[PDB]
C-alpha cells in the first residue's frame, strides 16, 4: 500500500507507469533523474505519509525508498 503511494508520486512527479517504475531498478539510472527528482519525490511521500524518508545518501532505487518510508512510517 505505501509503495502503491510512493509508486503514485513517483508515477505522477515523474510522469511514468506504475509498471516503469521497478523496485529493484534504479530511478536515477533507469529514468535518469537527478537529486532534484528524488528530492521532490521524498518531498512528495513526505507531504503525503510524513515519514522519515533518508535520501540523497546512496537511495535512489523504489525498493530502498520505498523500504526506507515504509520501514520509517511503521509505528
Known amino acids: 500500500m505505501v509503495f502503491e503511494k510512493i509508486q503514485a508520486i513517483?508515477?505522477?512527479?515523474?510522469?511514468k507507469?506504475?509498471?516503469e517504475?521497478?523496485?529493484?531498478?534504479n530511478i536515477?539510472?533507469?529514468?535518469d533523474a537527478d537529486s532534484l527528482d528524488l528530492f521532490q519525490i521524498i518531498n512528495e511521500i513526505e507531504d503525503e505519509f510524513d515519514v522519515k524518508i533518508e535520501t540523497e545518501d546512496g537511495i535512489?532505487?523504489?525498493?530502498?525508498?520505498?523500504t526506507y518510508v515504509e520501514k520509517q512510517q511503521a509505528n
Do not use: F, K, N, Y
Open 10 to 15: 513517483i508515477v505522477e512527479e515523474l510522469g
Open 17 to 19: 507507469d506504475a509498471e
Open 21 to 25: 517504475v521497478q523496485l529493484t531498478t
Open 28 to 31: 536515477q539510472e533507469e529514468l
Open 60 to 66: 535512489q532505487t523504489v525498493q530502498d525508498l520505498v
